[PDB]
Amino acid sequence: GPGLKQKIVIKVAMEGNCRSKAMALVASTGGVDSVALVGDLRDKIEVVGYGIDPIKLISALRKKVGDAELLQVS
Amino acid sequence: GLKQKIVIKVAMEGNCRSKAMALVASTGGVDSVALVGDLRDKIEVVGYGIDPIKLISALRKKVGDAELLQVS
């Protein structure tokens, strides 16, 4: 508690309703404070939270939505 | 078709947080969701073309008691 505070930007392949799936999965993750679609193409998700493990999050995304990659973490 | 800010209060009792966040985030027109308030019991929703009436009833059906607190 509260755990490490991070802002994480993920690129996800979500062209398909696919955006809605990505956003829901990320929003459902423990420690999440905010989730936002960003970039001109709305092809990225910015997540702010406390004690989020980006490793698990990324793996859950690749398993359930599509290819996903960490672009920023701070 | 301007940028909307909608704040909803959700009874956080059923994780109930996670469900609400997931439902709101998956709703049409939604660009961002954020948990806000000292008690983290409100969701701030930003987007374009969000229908607040449908959002609220979807929450009440699926997650629990929810009311609009702010629309701008």
Residue numbers in the entry:
A (entry chain B): 184 to 199, 201 to 258
B (entry chain A): 186 to 199, 201 to 258
Article excerpt on this structure:
NLRs are a conserved component of plants' innate immune systems and survey the host environment for perturbations caused by invading pathogens. Intriguingly, the NLR pair Pik-1/Pik-2, which recognises AVR-Pik, also binds the effector via an HMA domain but this domain is integrated between the CC and NB-ARC regions of Pik-1. The integrated HMA domains of RGA5 and Pik-1 appear to have evolved from a family of rice proteins that only contain the HMA domain. Each of the Pikp-HMA monomers adopts the HMA-domain fold (Pfam: PF00403), comprising a four-stranded antiparallel β-sheet and two α-helices packed in an α/β sandwich.
The closest structural homologue of Pikp-HMA (defined by PDBeFold [Krissinel and Henrick, 2004]) is the HMA domain of yeast protein Ccc2A, overlaying with an r.m.s.d. of 1.58 Å over 72 residues. Typically, HMA domains bind heavy metals, or lighter cations such as Cu1+ or Zn2+, via two conserved Cys residues and are involved in metal transport or detoxification pathways. Interestingly, these Cys residues are not conserved in Pik-1 HMA domains, including Pikp-1. Hence, the Pikp-HMA structure does not contain a metal ion, and the loop between β1 and α1, which usually contains the metal-chelating Cys residues, is disordered. The absence of obvious enzymatic activity in the effectors, and a lack of large conformation changes in Pikp-HMA in the AVR-PikD-bound and unbound states, supports the hypothesis that effector binding promotes domain re-arrangements in NLR complexes.
